[PDB]
Amino acid sequence: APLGYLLYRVGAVLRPEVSAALSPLGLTLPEFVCLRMLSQSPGLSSAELARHASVTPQAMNTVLRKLEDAGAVARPASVSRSLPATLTARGRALAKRAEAVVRAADARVLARLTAPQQREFKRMLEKLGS
Amino acid sequence: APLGYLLYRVGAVLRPEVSAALSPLGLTLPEFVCLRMLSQSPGLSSAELARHASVTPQAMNTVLRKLEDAGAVARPASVSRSLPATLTARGRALAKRAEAVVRAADARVLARLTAPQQREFKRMLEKLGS
Ligand SMILES: Nc1ccc(C(=O)O)c(O)c1
Ligand SMILES: Nc1ccc(C(=O)O)c(O)c1
């Protein structure tokens, strides 16, 4: 049971849970990843975004296109090139509600652990990913 | 810090470590995932294999093609269609040495935790992925 296999199994339980939590907001999981990462790291390559959402860059460009058409992401051409993609007010509010449902989805998956185990598990994750 | 982000960070530390451990054996990480999964679950869709190696199905078909050309995977046409892909003796021996270097790579990543924390962490992973 390589570590990476154990990690993959956890992601395989998490992802459909997160997707279903996000559905009533009209968002796919890739769209959520784009919103969240762009909210924290404005000006991010769609390659990086795609590696984080584990989708091809072409799929991410399609995500970007949909989020821009929706008024949640913009790239206003600088009257000074074009500005790196950032969230609008709309996108920030979207992002916030989506982060709330994703947090609840996470807690639902983490309920398989006791409260102390959840804290230790998140610490261990932080250490391993540092 | 959504759980999935913490998981992604851990995979982002693990993957280059595993890739470098596998390089002297002449294997990419996708090739390793194909070998290992085919060793345990003969007859597996290249879609499933690709989702586990987080590469596109086309990339996986290329992996399959290389592992077949190498004498590690076969698909002997049944004298009885074509048989589902399985490992040859060569592929099994390859798989075994590769599993050994991947295990050592894993332990190197897990050394950031004490021995008891590593045991508890693997238990927690098993529970969350069950
Ligand atoms: N980094 C990774 C990803 C997946 C696996 C896997 O065996 O499924 C791995 O051994 C390492
Ligand atoms: N299943 C996943 C994968 C990635 C993320 C992420 O925010 O990076 C997530 O929130 C859930």
Author numbering:
A (entry chain A), B (entry chain A): 7 to 86, 89 to 138
The paper states:
MarR family proteins are transcriptional factors which regulate the expression of genes involved in a wide variety of cellular processes, including stress responses, virulence, metabolic pathways and antibiotic resistance, mainly via ligand-mediated attenuation of DNA binding. Rv2887 functions as a transcriptional repressor; binding of effector molecule SA, or its structural analogue PAS, to the binding pocket of Rv2887 induces conformational change in its DNA binding domain, shrinking the distance between the α4 helices and preventing binding of Rv2887 to the promoter region of Rv0560c, triggering the expression of this SAM-dependent methyltransferase. Rv2887 is present as a dimer with a triangular shape and belongs to the α/β family of proteins. Each subunit is composed of two functional domains: helices α1, α5, and α6 form the dimerization domain, and helices α3 and α4 form a helix-turn-helix (HTH) DNA-binding domain.
Two molecules of SA/PAS bind Rv2887 in two deep symmetry-related pockets at the dimerization interface, where each ligand interacts with residues from both protomers. Rv2887 binds both SA and PAS in the same cavity surrounded by helices α1, α2, α3, and α5 from one protomer and helix α1 from the other protomer. Residue Arg42 of Rv2887 forms two hydrogen bonds with the carboxylic acid groups of SA and PAS, and residue Asp114 interacts with their hydroxyl groups via a water molecule bridge. Residues Leu20, Val24, Leu35, Phe38 and Val39 of one protomer interact with the phenol group of SA/PAS by van der Waals interactions, and residue Gly10 of the other protomer stacks to the phenol group plane. The hydrogen bond distances between residue Arg42 and the carbohydrate group of the ligand in the Rv2887-SA complex are shorter than those in the Rv2887-PAS complex, possibly explaining the higher affinity with which Rv2887 binds SA compared to PAS. The protein conformations in the Rv2887-SA and Rv2887-PAS complex structures are identical, with Cα atoms having an r.m.s.d. of 0.42 Å. Specifically, binding of SA or PAS causes the DNA binding (wHTH) domain to rotate up towards the dimerization interface by 15~20°, and the N-terminal to rotate forward to the ligand binding pocket. Rotation of the wHTH domain of one monomer and the N-terminal region of the other Rv2887 monomer result in the formation of a buried binding pocket for ligands, over which the N-terminal residues form a ‘lid’. The distances between the Gln64 Cα and Gln64′ Cα atoms are 13.6 Å, 14.6 Å and 15.4 Å in the apo, SA-bound and PAS-bound forms, respectively. The distance in the Rv2887-DNA complex is longer than that in the ligand-bound complexes, indicating that the conformational changes in the Rv2887-DNA complex may favor insertion of helix α4 into the major groove of the DNA, whereas the conformational changes in the ligand-bound Rv2887 complexes are incompatible with DNA binding.
